[PDB]
Amino acid sequence: KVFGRCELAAAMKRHGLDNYRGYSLGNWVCAAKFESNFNTQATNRNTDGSTDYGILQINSRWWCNDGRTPGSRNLCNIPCSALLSSDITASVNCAKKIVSDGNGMNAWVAWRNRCKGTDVQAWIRGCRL
Ligand SMILES: [Cl-]
Ligand SMILES: [Cl-]
Ligand SMILES: [Cl-]
Ligand SMILES: [Cl-]
Ligand SMILES: [Cl-]
Ligand SMILES: [Cl-]
Ligand SMILES: [Cl-]
Ligand code: NA
Ligand SMILES: [Tb+3]
């Protein structure tokens, strides 16, 4: 599923991401834009052999199992394919565990380099939330 911007914002809000660990909804929409372009089916292989999955490009090195990232963990206790569903529940629950780690949203490289410090509220502008 390729979400609309406000559509994704509404879904993220409903699942309790808005202001989670202090990160406003626009930060999460911005992260999703530059991680996956709002496409739940997005996958990208990392140089180390891990793969990033879904709307928030969650990495198999630590967070989900894809059976082909030797020596990795599965801290969200979920198959990585579950992060490609049209229903973002799984991606949101896992993202909550990721951002609760010491580095907050800096764990998302695209957030740090393209969202951090910018006018992220623009990403929810005009949305009927
Ligand atoms: Cl957009
Ligand atoms: Cl915001
Ligand atoms: Cl990740
Ligand atoms: Cl594995
Ligand atoms: Cl292993
Ligand atoms: Cl959803
Ligand atoms: Cl933080
Ligand atoms: Na893994
Ligand atoms: Tb950690």
UniProtKB/Swiss-Prot annotation:
Q: Which residues form a coiled coil?
A: none
GO process terms (BP) = cell wall macromolecule catabolic process; defense response to bacterium; defense response to Gram-negative bacterium; defense response to Gram-positive bacterium; killing of cells of another organism
Q: Name one Pfam family in it.
A: Lys
The tissues where this chain's protein is expressed are given as: In the egg white and polymorphonuclear leukocytes.
**Residue stretches making up the C-type lysozyme domain:** 1-129
Q: Where does substrate bind?
A: D101
Q: Where is the active site?
A: E35, D52
- Miscellaneous note of the record: Lysozyme C is capable of both hydrolysis and transglycosylation; it also shows a slight esterase activity. It acts rapidly on both peptide-substituted and unsubstituted peptidoglycan, and slowly on chitin oligosaccharides.
What do we know about how this protein assembles, alone or with others?
A: Monomer.
Could you say which protein family the record assigns here?
Answer: Belongs to the glycosyl hydrolase 22 family.
Functional note: Lysozymes have primarily a bacteriolytic function; those in tissues and body fluids are associated with the monocyte-macrophage system and enhance the activity of immunoagents. Has bacteriolytic activity against M.luteus.
Please report the name of this protein according to its UniProt entry: Lysozyme C
Give the source lineage, highest ranks first. Eukaryota, Metazoa, Chordata, Craniata, Vertebrata
Name the gene: LYZ
